[model samples]
Target: KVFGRCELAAAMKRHGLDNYRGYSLGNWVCAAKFESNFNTQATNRNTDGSTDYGILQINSRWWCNDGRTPGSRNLCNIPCSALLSSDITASVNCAKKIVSDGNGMNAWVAWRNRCKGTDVQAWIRGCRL
Candidate 1:
């Protein structure tokens, strides 16, 4: 599912992403825009033989198991395929785990480059969240 900006914002908030780890809902919305454009089925393969999955682009190297990423820790204890589901529950949960792991939202390069230090509130402006 490709969500509209405000729709994604509302969903993220409902999933407990609002202000999670001091990152605002807008910050998450911004990161999702740059990471996967709010597309649940998005996937990106890296040169390191790992893959990024789902809306937040969670990685296979340390987060989820894909059965192909070597030495995967599977810290989220979920299959990478789970991240691609339109339901987004697993994706949001794993993302919370990533933030709780002390990585914050910096675990995603897109967030660091695009959302960090920016006025991410614009990502959710005019949305009733």
Candidate 2:
């Protein structure tokens, strides 16, 4: 797992997520940190019997299929394992769709609880853009 924040920032910038769809990069960074501490292999099972995937912690109930459930929406059309790998491309692409479909970054409960309107931009501070 990568640790330094600038690398993540550069990655987000390279993936065009620095200002993706008008949302702040810091929010993504904050969400990533809060959701999974930037760990790609991160997985969290929900009380609803669904799972969250990858750095963005995309949900299985609405996005990927973990095979532990039936008829998942699988909006990203990916296996949950895909998001567990080190590469963020698939997760990033899926996240783009989610943000576009939902009400911006409000889809992430972590962002709402921890990042929203409260020093969220600081997630990118001290990182070279």
Candidate 3:
């Protein structure tokens, strides 16, 4: 379940993540770093009472169900727990869809507040892929 920036970059590239959903791989890596530090099981409670799940810290209110949020849009159509696993495929796919939904990386506070307009190359410095 350990994922550093280099490992994450390799996985994302293998899955064709660069330019996927219209974003650079650097942006994705940067966002993942600040959001969850590459922890697959990371979860956080938003000040708004909504919970974020997985490495991407996807919101349960819109993308998944914490099993308590009735009438959740569950846009990702996946159990919130699924995001808490080491397998990042589900998280990546869901994030891809989210970016395509028109928010781009702006959907993530980490990206908007930190990674945006900043140099993010160090996130994948030695990945070589």
Highest lDDT: which candidate? Answer: 1
Model 2: number of clashes? Answer: 0
Error of 2 at 74 (Å): 1.1
Task: For candidate 1, list the clashing residue pairs, or say none.
Answer: none
What is the Cα-based lDDT of residue 43 in candidate 2? 88
Q: What TM-score goes with each of the models? A: 0.97, 0.93, 0.92
Per-residue lDDT tens digits for candidate 1, residues 1-129, read 999999989998999999998888999999999999999999999999999999999999999999999877899999999999988799999999998887788888889998899999999999997
39-112 per-residue lDDT for model 3 (tens digits): 98898987767789888899988898777765667989898889888878888888987888877889998899
User: lDDT for every model?
Assistant: 0.92, 0.84, 0.85
Model 3 ranges with Cα > 4 A deviation:
none
In model 2, pairs of residues that clash are: none
Clashes of each: 0, 0, 0
Better of 2 and 3 by lDDT: 3
